[PDB]
């Protein structure tokens, strides 16, 4: 009779966006992983000290609040609000210092201490009874007040250093500590990776009179000392300098950058594990991309995008006579038939395997391209700590928008390449079948062939594995 080849007919699932048109496909999936309901924290420590500690207490190493100086830092951390009351000095913080201490208290790296070098360079630190509990600060009060000096040091990592002043309230104490007249404004400057400065004066003179008002009172009500702080940034190789006068204070620790913990905001659930956790839930295992609005995450995490996109999973539906599809039911994607169902139709696994492998290879190449673009766009030697510190209070990252646009443009190319590869596979298969059939077999040109003899179902399935031979079918002539 006649024989035809084509694709198995399956119900249409959806539509994908090719470069030149929209293609109807029998199966599609989503490239990026989706956030889940809870946080999977099986087999991991949770640090919760929000009942006794504060943001500044960890920095200043108050008793019982020593997260930055721990040994095995937990991945999840939580503590009191920024305006908590400590048991030592009253404190005031610059906006930059606030934005940087929201982050630096929970870095998971190793913090370098240089208080000793200061001790041998400038003698013993200042001593006061109001800071008995607190144990991490150097107070520069030389005998020859004020005696300005410049402290030079080659940094050991890339981090943040907190510097400023520690001054009392009464004029007598201020004069006795600084040795300067009350009507004098004096500066403390920091020159590392960037230049920063802060100004001070007497208690009843600007701008310290606002430092008293805006200060955060301590737990004990009989302390007159206020510590005013500001932040400066260093570099691993470069040398940083601090301009120190009498009364100046500095927290002797370089809070090295790196990955920093997250503060849970949703339900914490045990008995389940994951690999990429966020502040609002974890993510499924082995995701190529992540639906997230930031680069802050813990564990092994792929690049983040803002919205999902659809990629192909089956094949194009090029059918509704013979239109290209096969009415029979077969176990595969491509097949050959003689308009008979049940025994006269067979499927070939080679084309299906080639199509699946092509889909997988195209997806892998696209993922590699996206990863390379992400690395170029953020930098190979990046760090979440500095990436969020430099952002500040801004919650919109335009680089994420650029990355999302790049992924959106890449998905269309993926679909186009997959469809073109499928078309090439089909053309090669039909040309091979035509060559195998021989030159005495008429070709319809639409994928069907019309033999000069009768071709039963054995005639059909013989072609399936390519063992068909012309000799056994020479008998009889028909058109």
């Amino acid at each position: 009779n006649q024989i035809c080849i084509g694709k198995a007919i399956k119900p249409i699932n959806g539509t994908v966006e090719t470069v030149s048109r929209m293609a109807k496909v029998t199966g599609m999936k989503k490239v990026g992983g989706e956030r889940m309901q809870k946080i999977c924290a099986k087999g991991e420590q949770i640090h919760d000290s929000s009942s006794a500690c504060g943001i500044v207490s960890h920095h200043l190493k108050q008793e019982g609040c020593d997260f930055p100086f721990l040994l095995n830092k937990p991945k999840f951390a939580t503590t009191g609000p920024m305006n908590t009351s400590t048991t030592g000095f009253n404190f005031y913080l610059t906006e930059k210092a606030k934005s940087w201490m929201n982050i630096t208290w929970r870095v998971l790296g190793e913090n370098k201490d240089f208080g000793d070098n200061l001790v041998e360079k400038y003698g013993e630190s200042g001593a006061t009874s109001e800071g008995a509990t607190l144990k991490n600060y150097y107070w520069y009060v030389p005998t020859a007040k004020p005696g300005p000096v410049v402290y030079e040091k080659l940094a050991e990592c890339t981090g943040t250093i907190y510097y400023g002043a520690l001054l009392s309230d009464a004029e007598a104490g201020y004069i006795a500590v600084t040795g300067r007249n009350v009507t004098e404004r004096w500066d403390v400057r920091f020159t590392g990776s960037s230049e920063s400065s802060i100004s001070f004066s007497g208690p009843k003179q600007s701008p310290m009179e606002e430092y008293i008002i805006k200060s955060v009172r301590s737990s004990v009500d009989t302390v007159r000392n206020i510590i005013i702080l500001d932040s400066g940034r260093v570099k691993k190789g470069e040398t940083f300098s601090i301009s120190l006068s009498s009364g100046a204070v500095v927290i002797p620790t370089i809070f090295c950058d790196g990955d920093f913990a997250v503060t849970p905001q949703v339900q914490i659930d045990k008995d389940c594990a994951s690999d990429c956790h966020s502040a609002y839930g974890s993510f499924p295992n082995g995701s190529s991309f992540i639906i997230h609005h930031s680069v802050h995450t813990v564990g092994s995490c792929p690049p983040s995008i803002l919205r999902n996109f659809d990629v192909i999973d089956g094949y194009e539906a090029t059918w509704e006579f013979f239109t290209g599809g096969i009415q029979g039911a077969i176990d595969g994607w491509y097949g050959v038939t003689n308009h008979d169902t049940g025994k006269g139709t067979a499927a070939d696994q080679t084309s299906t395997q080639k199509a699946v492998e092509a889909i997988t290879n195209k997806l892998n190449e696209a993922i590699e391209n996206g990863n390379q673009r992400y690395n170029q766009l953020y930098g190979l030697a990046r760090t979440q700590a500095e990436l969020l510190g430099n952002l500040g209070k801004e919650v919109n990252d335009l680089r994420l928008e650029t990355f999302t646009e790049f992924i959106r443009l890449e998905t269309i190319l993926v679909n186009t390449r997959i469809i073109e590869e499928h078309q090439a596979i089909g053309s090669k298969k039909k040309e091979e079948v035509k060559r195998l059939l021989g030159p005495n077999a008429l070709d319809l040109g639409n994928g069907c062939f019309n033999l000069t003899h009768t071709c039963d179902s054995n005639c059909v399935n013989s072609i399936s594995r390519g063992t068909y031979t012309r000799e056994n079918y020479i008998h009889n002539v028909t058109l």
Copy 2:
């Protein structure tokens, strides 16, 4: 004889840019509208007070200059330059104050007042005879100078607040108002969405000695008071704080964000209305995009681009013996003929209607994609006032360049999609013709068919609406 189908031959208009090649088409149009010569301002109010007022006068609510406190603010406003002299105090403005006063005096929104709360918190304002004309300012002069305080308030909108000081020139007045020593430098700080500060000292002392020199003298020459102003930004939800001392002044009005009026620079023409207006001319009704160098506009306006692009409007000219075209004249785009002109050639409205629908749909999809990209790139909850304020003195916007590049890329995809859709329509039509014609008719493969019988002009017309029947044409045999 024989029958053929194809497209009507029309003169070639030009070339458009497809992804893979350049396509010669019989018609194109431009995606974006063009600025017109004049401004169409029919049925809209125009404000012009450049002969009596100035930028600062509107802020300070001078008698006869109260644009920000109006009820129905006109969309076109004009006033005197920045350095115009008011009838009240001599004034000095920081560069930020100038850059923000260029905008905030002509906002079309509603401004919020908080002078009352200041009155109850810190008593009555200071009194001076030199500011009788002015009516919008609060002068903080407590009984016990200096008496520093901090003013906290939760804002109601997103805008700018102008603060600073108001001090005399003589040393006696400065000492009487401020209560500070002349050899003292004090500060006024603003802490809202961002940190700002301003410094003052004695009249014969830096930095005020330059404040007198750079001040703008008033109309009356017997005033010794200078008001020094600076700008700060607030946020709708968060709380802003100002550090006040004796002598500090603040303008109690939050100039809320929103659209702001344009200052016409071309001829204003009545008797004609429009929808989108610019400072250099109006724009046509219902434009998909605007050829503009900035995002400042009034009325309903689409996204702005920097240069025009060509989109397809006809169809590709795939012809110069039959090449694909039809030499005869028909009312449409596609047609069928038997190499006869006038009565043997017939046209079908279905294919032309489908092509027009395809063009419209592709253009609509492109416009939607461009709008979505514009929204992503600027932000859904944006505001022209803050967008132009943050630019400052910069006249080049890189985001407009990015959007223009995106639109230039999108137009090529639009042309490719339209051409592919036209090709698909043509292929489907010729397949339908071949199946309707029958299996006894030879197919040339180039769109022509060669029948076994003679096919006159009535035969050609029969196929046109599909009522062709093979019975009445059985007679005679020809090849």
Copy 3:
């Protein structure tokens, strides 16, 4: 017998990336030129004064160190480090001043002077015996100290101006020069294209006690004068103002922007010349692009990218029976044969010339598009001096990354268009030859033609130039 046409078979060289697939081509090249080992500086003079001069000495016009005031400024310059010791005053520079002096000492433009205007406005400059060697500065010491003034001037070019103070160490000298009390802080402010300021106070008072410590001591150890400098920026059309008090100093020279010299870091070799020189080597003549990590170069230099990409140079290898190629060896790309080698195979130069011209035209269009995009992305009126000054200490330019991505995307389109044009040329050639042979010749559809008669080597050879005629080959009939 039969005749076939196709492409000459050549070994596969490489693979290029098309929009929808990966293409195998017989020849490819690289879009951008590559840096070489040395610097080809034949016929160019080199300035080297690293043993006597310093960065600041060139600005201050020390004897024997006058690069900024030359007439024929060399393209290659080298001098001592920033912290060298001059023979006059001790000097201190701000971070901005350091970053801008790293550049402005070697600009190749013409620098504008305005010292005469200052002299005729405010009298003669201050006189000190410690700066006899130095010759480029204006010291402001009015008779009636302090006597603050504001200096207004309309700038002549776009450049940088260095301003600050020149103050002694002893209290008596400071009081005599400035005329102020020691416990006073006074500011010098600059308002041009931007705002800048610097502060000064007594010697035993902040922030000058740190200026003394951080200063660079001069060669002579008996000097007490320290010059503290800072940088401000001006615009060609606008007016800049400086707030001058007694004791302030300004370097009266606008260092106009433009191309600035490069400091060699590799071996300098004469006896060889090039067109574009970088700081680490020259580049090949007539390069379309440059593999460079910055926009700093001397001479005529094309736009810079970060990595090379591959573009097609031959043609696609669409073959492994006849598959499309020609087994014979011919001098060209396209040819016609009758399965005979040596005399039955001939090639046509028309198709080869058309293909080469298409490749050249596509590359030229791509280069034009890239240059235009570079112009939009940096600006038509750009300047290397300001483009590198605004960067500061940042070594990564995101704009270069964006341009590299744009070039990478453009290369794919170039390959696609070239392949499409080659396919169109082949289709036109085969259609033309099929038309030439006539309607009595059988068409295989794969590019091979099968004649009713025998077609010897002379027959196939005559077809190449199109002089084939039917009359002399009618003899004999064969299928």
